[PDB]
Amino acid sequence: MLKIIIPTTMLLPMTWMSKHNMIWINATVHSLLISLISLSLLNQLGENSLNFSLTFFSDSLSAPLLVLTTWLLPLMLMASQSHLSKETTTRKKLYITMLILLQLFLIMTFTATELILFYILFEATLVPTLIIITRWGNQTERLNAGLYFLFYTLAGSLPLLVALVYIQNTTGSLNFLIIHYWSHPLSNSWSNIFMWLACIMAFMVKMPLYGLHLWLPKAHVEAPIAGSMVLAAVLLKLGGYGMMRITTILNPLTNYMAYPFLMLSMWGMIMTSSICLRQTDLKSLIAYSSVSHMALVIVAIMIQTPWSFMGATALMIAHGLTSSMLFCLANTNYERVHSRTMILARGLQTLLPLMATWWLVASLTNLALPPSINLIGELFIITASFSWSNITIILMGMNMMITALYSLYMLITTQRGKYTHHINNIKPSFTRENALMALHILPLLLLTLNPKMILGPLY
Template structure:
């Protein structure tokens, strides 16, 4: 674990002491080296559970894919931000890259920790850099509003979690994930225990986000700079799913009845947010709502607590992280050229940037779940386990899948096909940097098709 944590820490002095012209290349190279080192965690996915243990940090088959995704994303965020940060004063550029690095540091500590309380602290700590990114480097004047939504939704959800954790510590005497699974089962049947159960899960359901408490996400995504959108879509939403998977072990006897309303909300959210996507005019908003739809499936898969549901949820989280982040990068390349996120003002891009259209096509197909990509593997496993739990869920998940295909097609046709609008006179050509960025998103997705057991979690 230190092999990755120490280089991440050393990135801070590198950012602040590098000569100006080497700031972006050196931090990118450093980030890529950390990402490559993190791949060695894949060698240790033991079927028995924890590996690489020290008193505070460890990896297991559930946290390893998410840790590697967090490390993989830092160089991609640096690559994506380079163009629109080039005109900023040097100190602001350094601060920006520092914030991205601190996010990675907190995420590694959150996913790698064995103490639930440390996980809670790091879960909250990721708020601060993300909030600064949104409110300082966001695109429009609405960004302060978006930052407020983001902060208060997440904080209001996670304060009950703090109380629930303190009560658990009082009851079992430990909050270590290594021990708490073996402590005597908590026979919880009173009303206060049901509120305790809700306190545990609501923080993660807000973070995922569950339909009904999702309003902060489209706002935060639309206003965030590209790196903010990427890290939100790819990793921060996954903190919610990861936390739920960890906590479900402790809430056992209660979950059977109490999970019903949340499963219903999650599946209803798949349909509702998909339908909202069908009438979006703003490109980033459409991709943000599609994230809510996919995360609804993940939440339902985790809440029914079957091995297939858990595996499907983890596979879909990793696949969605890469595909959704790729779509945000593509939306950003459009925005940098046309300075508008309104789809109807920037259509017909295929005639001008044909290679970019290829990336759009692959990313859109990945997002809607084209076989044999991992997105489809995850969705199929969740849909199958939900059908096994109750055949009626097929109506909701089937409709959700159809709507997903509909809005994905709508997004692709609106941005790429049709005549070029008359007001677009000149556009920058696509850069090698952008093609490299897309390759580094899509290549892991395609490679995971050949070895999906790397992200199957405990059920491999």
């Protein structure tokens, strides 16, 4: 597994020893090659994981997450080099260093065998993200956003640490293989109830769960483009991965402790999806669609069935790709008109025909058009929820209807109608932006032909 880690670490001295006008080229090429190397982890077994060493292992759940993480870095570098043009050389290298450190932390987080090491890396991912948001964000709110990002997460994860070192003191180990094999039921007691809460709330805040999702519309909106791309595509999935990993110790306590979270998720799906209908900020609309999509992953993980776990894995990957593409698409317009108001620039299909096609495809994948993997994950979760209770079809059905409404609305407001008369600085699309959209959308469509690669360990 060091054959991926060490090349990623070499991106730092390579970036710092590069010419002033060659950092973007070198970083992009070598991060793409690291993605190529990362593709080898998709060769998974049917029975157990790829146990590289005592420290690192790879499973059918973490391999697609690793591939998405490595694939996202070149796209972030491509999306960042436009608005960082006037920046000094050393600050450009510092921004690229922040991105490389984030990738390194995420790669180790997804493959750590022991839960304390996983916790340390999963918390270390906060520092580069906060620095990115609060140093390179554009507005004065970016400071407050940073605080919201910092303290929502930590207030959730500080109990988790206390739980973890507690568990090792009673079971003897925090190794995930040992934890899974030597698993024992959780009794029905107040102490076990609070241990269950300490093991779960940290991940719930990362998803985030409706009710503790306030930090997200601030952090994603105020962040720079690469910050929001990594926040939506990978950092939200840390909660899903951690919940999937930690659920084994939780049973049979999860059957009754999951009710408040299932109610919050199944209602906040409707709440945030409807919030998207009345949103004057385009980037804020895209951010809220993420909460609406992750409510479904929370439901799938809480109900604890093989179909739900498969659906949650597929939906996490598909949402990562689609939300990253949507944030980039909004940034293309922002770098033209310098405002995130959705109705400021209209009728753009007339002026930018191919970027309109990109918008249409992104909106189609957002509303889970078959046979996209967005739809595969959504439908698997809906089927498992129907098994859990038939009445769920009403809530699930309603969410689907609303999701299509605010997606196409987002399409109709920005692309159709007539272009505003005063704006006259709308330049033709650059090759960089078009390629950035294509490198988002082509892997998404290609994953339809081999969905077993993104369906997790329950396939």
